[PDB]
Amino acid sequence: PADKSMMAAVPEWTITNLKRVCNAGNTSCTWTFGVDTHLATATSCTYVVKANANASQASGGPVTCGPYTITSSWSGQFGPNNGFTTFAVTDFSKKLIVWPAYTDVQVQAGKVVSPNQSYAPANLPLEH
Amino acid sequence: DKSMMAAVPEWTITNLKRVCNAGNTSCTWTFGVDTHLATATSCTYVVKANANASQASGGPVTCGPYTITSSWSGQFGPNNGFTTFAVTDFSKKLIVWPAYTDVQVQAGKVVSPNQSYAPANLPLE
């Protein structure tokens, strides 16, 4: 059969008010953001990543926020100036997943990312 | 508020296949990346680990214009383990995340149908 688009026929999920707050020693980074699917009222998420060092680079999760299972990994593959975090936000019940990705520059000041960034959910053919 | 999805065709991961050695210390992923606007790129993507290379985080590996990493997650239990690739065209600042359950790739068989993913913009500098 034809190539299968994995993009769901749903509105893009908007990640709202995304901010990273890391403690003094960068052993705990707290990500706060909303998942706004528009089809439902937005889910507010507190996503804490801990590590012995460089929590801002550490892989995090799985953390459950509302219907979502959230992980995150950081990549310096393009150099430390071009480091970026990729969240994996999965609604298990809907079998939908998005990958919000934020460069360190966007989040380094601990200031909100604006505008809010929206991503097209992909189907993930999990088997219930 | 601002869509990060690029206004280009979805990229198709063609003939995605995972082959792991006997001890699962090395899994070789083979696939093509077809943007449909340029010649497809053939990719060989080897993940090695002391154990469970099929669960190991891979990359970065370069295949043509793409920098590829991969992450595996058992957050939904072993039955619903799935691998997420991060395929980034750094020059275009475009990235897709082809995601395949272990069910889809366990046979070492080619994933069919091929699966297409909408690239997102990655605002690198």
Swiss-Prot record, chain B:
GO biological process: effector-mediated perturbation of host innate immune response by symbiont
Function: Stimulates salicylic acid signaling in host plant roots.
Subcellular location: Secreted
Highest taxon in the source lineage: Eukaryota
Protein species of origin: Hypocrea virens (strain Gv29-8 / FGSC 10586)
Disulfide bonds: 20-27, 43-63
GO cellular component: extracellular region
Keywords tagged on the record: Disulfide bond, Secreted, Signal
Name of protein: Effector TSP1
Oligomeric form and interacting partners: Homodimer.
Induction: Induced during growth on maize and banana roots.
Residue ranges the record marks as coiled coil: none
